[PDB]
Amino acid sequence: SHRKFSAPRHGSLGFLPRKRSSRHRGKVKSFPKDDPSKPVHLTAFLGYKAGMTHIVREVDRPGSKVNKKEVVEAVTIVETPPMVVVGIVGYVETPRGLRTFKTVFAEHISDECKRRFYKNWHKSKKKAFTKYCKKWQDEDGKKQLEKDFSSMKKYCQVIRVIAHTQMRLLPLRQKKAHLMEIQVNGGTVAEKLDWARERLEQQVPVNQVFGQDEMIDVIGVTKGKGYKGVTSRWHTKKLPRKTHRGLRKVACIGAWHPARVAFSVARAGQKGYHHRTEINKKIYKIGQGYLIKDGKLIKNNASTDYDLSDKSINPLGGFVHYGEVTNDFVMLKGCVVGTKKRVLTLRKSLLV
């Protein structure tokens, strides 16, 4: 018979399965649509969740009760040292999807990037790309690389740069660099290759990818919680105290028929450490890293036009469980997924 009282289902079936993410680094499942009219530009960036503080600002929202009034808004600090472009990858549109056409790497690869290629760097001979790099010097290699760039020019429709973070500038135990592909939008494919070739081995600051007052998306892996019951994983109503055999359960996991447990019923299992893509996280401040100017160290990235105090974004005593933020950072309104020290993928908005 029908359930006496109507009630919404507990949880969303659009985030199934609730399994531990197969990847630790956030993956850009969809890059922004390419408008050839736009200038050549990167669409994503990698940052690290340092921690959260709060700000005070005046709101210009006509018709609101906070119009021309000051509010306190929580913000998240994402440390974004410049990324190094170490490769270009081309994609061809096929009736089976997008296919990796050709990959060209730069001549010089840092040990930060090279650590990504090894499970045990300590025991390795660090031979990765040792023979590949000679292509940039040998005459035969130079022609072969030019054939690759021309073939990518002629056949590829999607051009992406392979860039890596600089883990040496971060206060983390990890020295292995997170590498990712960042799509290059704008311009023609020929302009994409010309633009990407110049950036090879170069650094790209975060302020060249994102701007002030921009709605961006944050992609990353949520905080892991381990094995969780239905009460915590799916937020099902707790059963009465008198319940025998335990009460942190779902009482009925299905009708007699169909004679199988359905996939839509709440079950115990892994909670957290799920890949997620939150959107419309506004950029409040693109902070500058510590700078050495004419002998002295400039670190007043937390000073505003109304609080001229010479202080850094670092809270007194440093960010808890993260460290000190000395590089460029992005101040995002609200919270984002992941623990402290979690690598986050910052993507431009897919929407208008």
Binding site: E93, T94, P95, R96, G97, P258, R260, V261, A262, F263
Partner: protein, 201 residues
């Protein structure tokens, strides 16, 4: 007969072509079907779209991941039609099914091969001119096929190349008709032998 039978799917009716293909793969005879997007289905489009939407509703209730797989590509739709016409739960049927290759558009290497039609399944032959029919390409595009535009772009490229090849053939054939007229005295006697036995008219 040929080792591999390459069939152009354009202008053909889905079920009629599937019946012919299913028999051939059961008799050995590796078959390759191309341009499955060009396959037609009898009846107006909306009726056929309703039929396939009704197919999407069939999912295992307890676990749709195990339930029927709704393949959106015109190639896979035709492939599933053929599978329904085979004993695909036996080794004989499975081996027969492996002998069939289906492609949307004409991929290499079959784009530079002569493609054969099946007049018993051709729409111009099997359907009255006043009956409505549906295109498998449009039907698939509206049930979740993503690569209608990419296939259409690549097919236009292939057709450009095939016309250059045809212009070359017409040039070569015009020259061969010129060649025969020049050397007609030297091949007169050989021409009569062909004419005597009906090899020429």
């Amino acid at each position: 007969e040929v080792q591999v039978l390459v069939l152009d799917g354009r202008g053909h009716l889905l079920g009629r072509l599937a019946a012919i293909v299913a028999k051939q793969v059961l008799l050995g005879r590796k078959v390759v079907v191309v341009r499955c997007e060009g396959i037609n289905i009898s009846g107006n489009f909306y009726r056929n779209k309703l039929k396939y939407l009704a197919f999407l509703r069939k999912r295992m209730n307890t676990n749709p991941s195990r339930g029927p797989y709704h393949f959106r590509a015109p190639s896979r739709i035709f492939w599933r039609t053929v599978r329904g016409m085979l004993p695909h739960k036996t080794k004989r049927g499975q081996a027969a099914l492996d002998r069939l290759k289906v492609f949307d558009g004409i991929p290499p290497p079959y784009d530079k091969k002569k493609r054969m039609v099946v007049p018993a399944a051709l729409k111009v032959v099997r359907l009255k001119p006043t009956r409505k029919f549906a295109y498998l390409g449009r039907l698939a595009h509206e049930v979740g096929w993503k690569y209608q535009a990419v296939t259409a772009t690549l097919e236009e490229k292939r057709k450009e190349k095939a016309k250059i090849h045809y212009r070359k053939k017409k040039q070569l054939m015009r020259l061969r008709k010129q060649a025969e007229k020049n050397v007609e005295k030297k091949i007169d006697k050989y021409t009569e032998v062909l004419k005597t036995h009906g090899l020429l008219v």
